[PDB]
Amino acid sequence: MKLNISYPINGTQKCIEIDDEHRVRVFYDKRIGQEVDGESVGDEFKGYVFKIAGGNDKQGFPMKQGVLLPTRVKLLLAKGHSCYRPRRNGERKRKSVRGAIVGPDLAVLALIITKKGEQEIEGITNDTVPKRLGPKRANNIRKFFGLTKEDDVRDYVIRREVTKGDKSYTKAPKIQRLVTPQRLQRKRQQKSLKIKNAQAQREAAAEYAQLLAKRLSERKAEKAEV
Amino acid sequence: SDAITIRTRKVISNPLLARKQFVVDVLHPNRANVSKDELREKLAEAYKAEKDAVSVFGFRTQYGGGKSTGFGLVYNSVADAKKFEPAYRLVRYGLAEKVEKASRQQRKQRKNRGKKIFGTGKSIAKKAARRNAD
Amino acid sequence: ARGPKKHLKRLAAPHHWMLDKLSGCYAPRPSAGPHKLRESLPLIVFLRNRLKYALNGREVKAILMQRHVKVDGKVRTDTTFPAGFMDVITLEATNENFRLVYDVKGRFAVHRITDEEASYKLAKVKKVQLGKKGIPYVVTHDGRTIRYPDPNIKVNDTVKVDLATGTITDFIKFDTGKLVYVTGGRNLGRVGTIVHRERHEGGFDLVHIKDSLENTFVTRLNNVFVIGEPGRPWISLPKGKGIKLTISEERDRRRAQHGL
RNA sequence: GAAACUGCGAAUGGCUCAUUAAAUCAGUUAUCGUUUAUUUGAUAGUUCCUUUACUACAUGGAUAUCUGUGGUAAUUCUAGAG
RNA sequence: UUCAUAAUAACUUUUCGAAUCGCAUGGCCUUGUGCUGGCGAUGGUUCAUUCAAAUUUCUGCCCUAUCAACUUUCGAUGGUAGGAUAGUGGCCUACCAUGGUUUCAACGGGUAACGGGGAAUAAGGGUUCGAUUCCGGAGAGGGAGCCUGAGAAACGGCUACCA
Ligand SMILES: [Mg+2]
Ligand SMILES: [Mg+2]
Ligand SMILES: [Mg+2]
Ligand SMILES: [Mg+2]
Ligand SMILES: [Mg+2]
Ligand SMILES: [Mg+2]
Ligand SMILES: [Mg+2]
Ligand SMILES: [Mg+2]
Ligand SMILES: [Mg+2]
Ligand SMILES: [Mg+2]
Ligand SMILES: [Mg+2]
């Protein structure tokens, strides 16, 4: 059938159509979350190693990992799960699903190619598509290069340069989380507030104690008479 | 003479809204209604404002002409008038343009259509394009 | 049922709003705040239906949003924020400071007040309690909760609150023969002196109150807010001064004061 | 400044009178018998752990919209990939 | 009041005590780019406050005796103790007791009964009528069951089953 093959490191996708039943029979009775060889699956794929994750049955009910059965099963699903994007904050729904094990009823098998082989397929392994985004967090940025605290951000930011037609202009990421003046100032202010309020409270308490003392004494001046 | 005589009953000055509001009493004799523009013009020299800063509404003649009772606000600044007036009045005056908007029903339909797709429609269009081979 | 009511149909609307029977399916429900729904007064009603400073809801909103209106020191941007009894409504432009204090008929009065007096909110006391870290605190019937009150402040006592900071300047004890203002029900908006408080087990404390006109009336202690000593109320009282006249007298006043 | 995440909101309103005869409901009680987002107020020098060779605090970890690949006749169905 | 609170003992798959944003951006020099600082948004712990919410006292309903006994196995009434709940309670469970309601109409049966506020009716008393502009209450085809959330047993939210 249709094999949805993908390289993650190279970051590239393809759909390969297979009609030969002998090529299909490698996938029968296999559960999703398993490791597939290259050579039996195809003559083009030799030395290659797949990991199998996800698919799609005919009639369009997606393969969910951890159902078991080679069948279609109605299932009650909510947030955190696959095959369901909820339309309300915390709402279940009983959809239908196709079991994690593979038989004849499938239209697509989603396959991830984990280890290379001999023959490179057209442009899936040959040509690469780069990352859409760069790191947004400062820590993340640091991770991308390996710089340590002293080196600072700003220096290594992936700026995009876009053209309207004649005018060429720049777009840059807002690097959230930084050793910026404003943040520091805010922190200082917070600290001050924490101290100041406490101080005020202490003062108030002292004053009230004093007041109480100035009532107790008064009480004692009236009591001693008879 | 037709007199055209203007009067300003109950002058309330709003330092909140930066405008003088009042009930216009207007004397017609032998003339049906008065037209807002003329009234504004008259006020613009009575209070010193210029037609723009004057805003008169309400009216409707009493009976057999004679009298008309409106509501005139006179704004301290024209900018202020622009930013404190509801837009319909501005449009009437001629200051602001009528907001070129489609029918309510159409808008609602569009909204509903938007609801029936998740996120951006570019992806959906692309998918449709591939579904032509199906 | 099914959860908190959001609206308020323009009828079920409290009558002391002095709202119109017409002009709208709804009235403005005041939000939660320092006062009870039925005995507050939302600002949309105030800046429109009384002062006539605005002329519709949008206008009111605009006025609020420029942030010139102030209720009791703090700003307020809410359209329907409950300005109840004793609320000081200061507007920086106009310099028209108000203190919301009832008329003799019941309805809230446009009491226009000097920038020297409009500074302190007098406030009745709902509760005297002891909170956390063993600290005693007072509750004002009129919304606020004051940390550290003088040990000689008890329940149902009125309190001059700074409002400039939010502490106690002075207080009036609940005593017989002390000027008192009525804030509830039928006698609402009258002023007087208090002759008796009936100690009464459980079923409400009552106050027989003579006014200046030597005409008694009796109300519940919840409906009564102390105002000062005889001769000296801490608040300026409205035109009418909380004495209230019989219908005939009122009629006479109306038809004698014809000055065109 | 589309989208989408996060927050809120969707429990109000609006419709109707089928139930339902001390039930609802009205007035009056009470909550010293309770939960209460919100509004308004108030509210954390003490978080450490043997406390001279010590702890990023001029700040620490991975996930989801779009880019590409699909499926299914379809529908606020969505798998895999970065 | 065993309340509010404070105190000693421990307690906890140690709840919370800010790894939040915007526009301002000045005083003093140990001349570091230093120490700091304002207004406001959000949050967040309890405590009030309010919007409420449950429950809850008393008193009051239309016919029907061609309805005189009803209620208790499987909660009827109460007790103790639990469990549950936001919290009280036969709310459910264990065990014990035998109550409770009734001709001053219980329980049934009806209703072409949603309940008030009110409407018509023009002496006085009254009759009928209130689906309906306000206040409650139910209900979203019927029965169920629940998820999220402060708040639904939600129906322009699910989950069956029956129609
Ligand atoms: Mg930031
Ligand atoms: Mg959302
Ligand atoms: Mg409703
Ligand atoms: Mg019925
Ligand atoms: Mg018990
Ligand atoms: Mg009836
Ligand atoms: Mg009715
Ligand atoms: Mg009917
Ligand atoms: Mg139907
Ligand atoms: Mg609904
Ligand atoms: Mg339901």
Dist CA B41 CA B36 (whole Å):
9
CB contact under 8 Å between B16 and C58, yes or no, is no
Residue C105, both tokens: 């008929």
CB contact under 8 Å between C53 and B86, yes or no, is no
Q: How many CB atoms lie within 10 A of CB C174?
A: 20
- Residues in chain C with CB shorter than 8 Å from the CB of B71 are 55
C47 burial type by CB count under 10 A (0-12 exposed, 13-18 middle, 19+ buried): buried
CA-to-C1' span, C5 to E113 (A): 29
CB nearest C93 (choices: B12, B16, B21): B16
Tell how far CA C173 is from the center of its chain: 19
- Residues in chain B with CB shorter than 8 Å from the CB of C93 are 15-16
CB A75 within 8 A of CB A100: no
CB A45 within 8 A of CB A117: yes
CA distances from C220 to B120, C54, C84, C196, C198 (A): 64, 37, 19, 12, 10
Beta partners for residue B28, in sequence order: none
Place of tokens 């692309």: B126
Comparing alpha-carbon positions, the chain A residue that sits nearest to C133 is A205
The nucleotides of chain E lying under 7 Å from a protein CB are: 4-7, 18, 20-25, 36-41, 46-54, 133-138, 147-155, 157-160
- Residues in chain C with CB shorter than 8 Å from the CB of B15 are 91, 93-94
Dist CA A165 CA A161 (whole Å):
12
Is the four-CA dihedral C223, C226, C230, C235 of positive or negative sign?
negative
CB nearest A211 (choices: C135, C147, C150): C150
The fold of the B1-134 domain, in CATH, is: Alpha-Beta Plaits (3.30.70)
Contacts of C73 (CB under 8 A, 6+ apart): C88, C163, C164, C166
Domains of chain C: 1-116 (3.10.290.10), 121-171 (2.40.50.740), 174-244 (2.30.30.30)
Comparing alpha-carbon positions, the chain C residue that sits nearest to B72 is C55
Q: Which residue out of C46, C56, C59, C76 would a mutagenesis test of the B interface target, given it has the greatest number of B Cβ atoms within 10 Å? A: C59
C176 φ, ψ (degrees, to nearest 5): -70, 130
- The residues spanned by each domain of chain A are 1-130, 131-226
Q: Compute, in angstroms, the gap from residue C65 CA to the centroid of ligand 1.
A: 27
CB nearest C63 (choices: B17, B21, B71): B17
CA-to-C1' span, C8 to D22 (A): 31
C78-103 burial, b at 16+ Cβ within 10 Å, e below that, comes to bbbbbbbbbbbbbbeeeebbbbbbbb
CB contact under 8 Å between B17 and C91, yes or no, is no
CA distances from B57 to B4, B99, C238 (A): 17, 21, 35
Place of tokens 């409707």: B60
The nucleotides of chain D lying under 7 Å from a protein CB are: 2-5, 7, 9-14, 29-30, 37-45, 47, 56-62, 65-82
CB A6 within 8 A of CB A14: yes
Q: Which of C154, C152, C153, C157 is nearest to C178 (CA)?
A: C157
CB C4 within 8 A of CB C32: no
Angle (nearest 5°) at CA A15 between A12 and A20: 140
CB A35 within 8 A of CB A51: yes
Dist CA C39 CA C212 (whole Å):
26
What are A's interface residues with C at a Cβ cutoff of 8 A?
Answer: 204-205, 207-208, 211-212, 215
Q: Compute, in angstroms, the gap from residue C31 CA to the centroid of ligand 3.
A: 19
CB A63 within 8 A of CB A54: yes
Is the four-CA dihedral A115, A117, A122, A123 of positive or negative sign?
positive
Dist CA C47 CA C44 (whole Å):
6
CB C62 within 8 A of CB C107: no
What are C's interface residues with A at a Cβ cutoff of 8 A?
Answer: 135, 147-148, 150-152
CB contact under 8 Å between B16 and C94, yes or no, is yes
The terminus-to-terminus CA distance of chain B in angstroms comes to 84
Q: Which residue out of A197, A201, A202, A208 would a mutagenesis test of the C interface target, given it has the greatest number of C Cβ atoms within 10 Å? A: A208
* 3-state secondary structure at position C206: strand
Contacts of A19 (CB under 8 A, 6+ apart): none
Helix (H) or strand (E) holding B129: helix B122-130
CB B29 within 8 A of CB B3: yes
Q: Which of C234, C184, C243, C247 is nearest to C214 (CA)?
A: C243
CATH assignment, A131-226 = 1.20.5.2650
Dist CA A86 CA A137 (whole Å):
29
Dist CA C166 CA A198 (whole Å):
17
Comparing alpha-carbon positions, the chain B residue that sits nearest to C56 is B86
Dist CA C149 CA C127 (whole Å):
11
B36 burial type by CB count under 10 A (0-12 exposed, 13-18 middle, 19+ buried): buried
Beta partners for residue A98, in sequence order: A63, A72
Q: Compute, in angstroms, the gap from residue A178 CA to the centroid of ligand 1.
A: 8
- Residues in chain A with CB shorter than 8 Å from the CB of C137 are none
CB C149 within 8 A of CB C139: no
Contacts of C107 (CB under 8 A, 6+ apart): C16, C17, C18
Pairing relationship of beta strands B6-14 and B19-27 according to DSSP bridges? antiparallel
CB contact under 8 Å between C150 and A204, yes or no, is no
3-state secondary structure chain A: CEEEEEECCCCEEEEEECCCHHHHCCCCCCECCEEEECCCCCCCCCCCEEEEEEEEEHHHCEECCCCCCCCEEEEEECCCCCCCCCCCCCCCEEEEEECCECCCCEEEEEEEEEECCCCCCCCCCCCCCCCCCCCCCHHHHHHHHCCCHHHCCCCCCCCEEEECCCCEEEECCCCCCCCCHHHHHHHHHHHHHHHHHHHHHHHHHHHHHHHHHHHHHHHHHHHCCC
CB contact under 8 Å between C148 and A204, yes or no, is yes
Q: Which of B12, B67, B70, B20 is nearest to B46 (CA)?
A: B20
Whether nucleic acid strand E comes within 7 Å of the CB of C21, the answer is no
CB contact under 8 Å between B16 and C53, yes or no, is yes
Dist CA C207 CA C193 (whole Å):
10
